[PDB]
């Protein structure tokens, strides 16, 4: 329940959307890794 | 609202001159020449005619009875 509803609800709440949740989480992890390696700057929160 | 009877600064009566000034300016005459012809030489008096808004027409439509 917390996987389907409470993790990445915008992807979906059906079990068919679990895999796309995995792809989105992998993309987020890739971004955080790139920040760890310094290949990208910090994301500004006041940037419109 | 409606044109002030007297200039706020020196008290010169400018109530009558506003409609003549408006119609002459709409006719295409030079505003400086019109204001000189009307007799308003001090710029305090010219401020009264040049910056006035006839707002009475826009509020006459609502009645209080």
């Amino acid at each position: 329940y917390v996987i389907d509803n409470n993790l990445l609800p915008h992807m979906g709440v059906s079990p068919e959307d679990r895999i796309k949740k995995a792809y989105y989480l992998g993309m987020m992890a890739l971004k955080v890794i790139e920040l760890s390696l310094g290949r990208r700057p910090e994301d500004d929160k006041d940037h419109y | 609202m409606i044109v002030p009877v007297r200039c706020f600064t020196c008290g010169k009566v400018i109530g009558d001159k506003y409609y003549e000034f408006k119609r002459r300016v709409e006719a295409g005459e030079d505003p400086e020449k019109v204001l000189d012809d009307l007799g308003l030489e001090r710029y305090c008096c010219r401020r009264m005619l040049l910056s006035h808004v006839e707002l009475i027409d826009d509020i006459m439509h609502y009645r209080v009875y």
Binding site: H10, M28, L35, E42 | -
Partner: protein, 49 residues
């Protein structure tokens, strides 16, 4: 009514209520930043549904 009035508001129990826009963070977009405390890189997303 005043023809100059632009509308865009509600009348609730006789009072005029205007809804002010809220400057929220972009949904479904992940943002990366540094915690600077545990040397942990944090990437958060606000998923809306």
């Amino acid at each position: 009514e005043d023809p100059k009035d632009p509308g865009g508001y509600f009348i609730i129990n006789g009072s005029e209520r205007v809804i002010v826009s809220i400057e929220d963070i972009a949904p479904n977009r992940t943002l990366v930043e540094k915690d600077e405390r545990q040397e942990k890189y944090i990437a958060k997303v606000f998923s809306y549904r």
